[PDB]
Design a protein around this ligand. Structure first.
Ligand SMILES: [Mg+2]
Ligand SMILES: [Mn+2]
Length: 252
C-alpha cells in the first residue's frame, strides 16, 4: 500500500519509520482534515489579513483535527519506496465533539470511518510530542510543503505548544518560523505569483497529475501537494524555486 494509515495502535512504529527516513527524504508535504468551519469572527479588524488570522485562530482553537497527511520526498521529488504518504487518523467523537454537519457528511462520503476514529483514533498530544522529537520540525534541513497553510500549521502549533494560539498574527508567524524554519505555501506561489486561482485538484488536473487515493483525505491530498510542487518547480521555475517565496503565507 502506497498510503500507510496510522492509528493509536501503530503510531509509535510509524513515527520511527519516518524518523529513519527524514534525513534521506527531507521534503515533507502535508495536508489536514478538520470538521469544516463552524463560526466567523465578529466585529471589524486591523486589516483583511487580520480578519483571516482571527477566523483561522477561532476555528483551529475549538475544532478537533481529524486527519493529518505527511508525504516524504527527497530534494528532487522521489518518495521513499516504503510509503508514498502517511495518514494519521486522530481521535474524534461524533456526539461529543463540535463540527459542521456538512463537513462530516462530506468526510463520510469521502471514505472516513468515524467509528474507528472514536475507538483507535490518535491523541494529538501524543503525536505532537513524537513530532517534536522526530527531526521533522525545528530543523532547517527539512522543507515543509503545503496548500493554504495557516490552517495546516495552526493545527500543528496547537498540538505542539498545548496552549491557545497567539492573539496577534505577528506572533503566530514568529512561532511558525521556529518549528518550520523552511517552508513553501503552494497557494501563495500559484496565486500570489503565477496568478492562478484554481484549487488543489483543479491544479492537479490541468497538470494531469494522477491522484493516488480518495479526494478529501489527508494522506492522498498531501501526496498530491508534493507532486504539484515538484511539477510546478520544474515547469515554471526551471528546477529552482525562487526563494523569495520561502516562508510566504497566503492571506496573512
Ligand atoms: Mg484537505
Ligand atoms: Mn488543506
Amino acid at each position: 500500500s502506497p498510503i500507510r494509515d496510522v492509528w493509536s495502535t501503530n503510531l509509535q512504529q510509524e513515527m520511527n519509520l519516518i524518523m529513519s527516513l527524514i534525513e534521506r527524504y527531507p521534503v515533507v508535504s502535508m495536508d489536514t482534515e478538520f470538521p469544516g468551519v463552524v463560526a466567523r469572527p465578529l466585529g471589524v479588524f486591523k486589516s483583511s489579513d487580520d480578519y483571516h488570522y482571527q477566523t483561522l485562530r477561532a476555528n483551529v482553537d475549538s475544532l478537533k483535527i481529524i486527519q493529518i497527511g505527511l508525504a516524504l520526498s527527497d530534494e528532487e521529488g522521489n518518495a521513499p519506496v516504503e510509503a508514498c504518504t502517511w495518514q494519521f487518523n486522530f481521535t474524534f467523537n461524533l456526539q461529543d465533539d463540535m463540527y459542521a454537519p456538512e463537513s462530516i457528511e462530506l468526510l463520510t462520503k469521502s471514505g472516513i470511518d468515524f467509528k474507528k476514529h472514536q475507538e483507535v483514533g490518535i491523541e494529538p498530544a501524543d503525536f505532537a510530542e513524537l513530532l517534536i522529537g522526530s527531526g521533522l520540525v525545528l530543523q532547517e534541513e527539512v522543507t515543509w510543503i503545503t496548500f493554504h497553510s495557516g490552517y495546516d500549521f495552526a493545527y500543528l502549533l496547537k498540538a505542539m505548544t498545548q496552549i491557545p494560539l497567539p492573539a496577534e498574527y505577528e506572533e503566530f508567524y514568529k512561532i511558525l518560523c521556529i518549528y518550520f524554519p523552511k517552508n513553501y505555501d503552494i497557494k501563495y506561489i500559484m496565486k500570489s505569483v503565477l496568478n492562478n486561482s484554481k484549487g488543489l485538484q483543479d491544479i492537479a488536473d490541468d497538470l494531469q497529475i494522477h491522484r493516488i487515493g480518495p479526494q478529501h483525505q489527508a494522506g492522498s491530498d498531501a501526496l498530491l501537494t508534493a507532486r504539484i510542487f515538484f511539477e510546478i518547480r520544474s515547469r515554471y521555475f526551471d528546477g529552482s524555486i525562487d526563494s523569495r517565496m520561502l516562508n510566504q503565507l497566503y492571506g496573512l
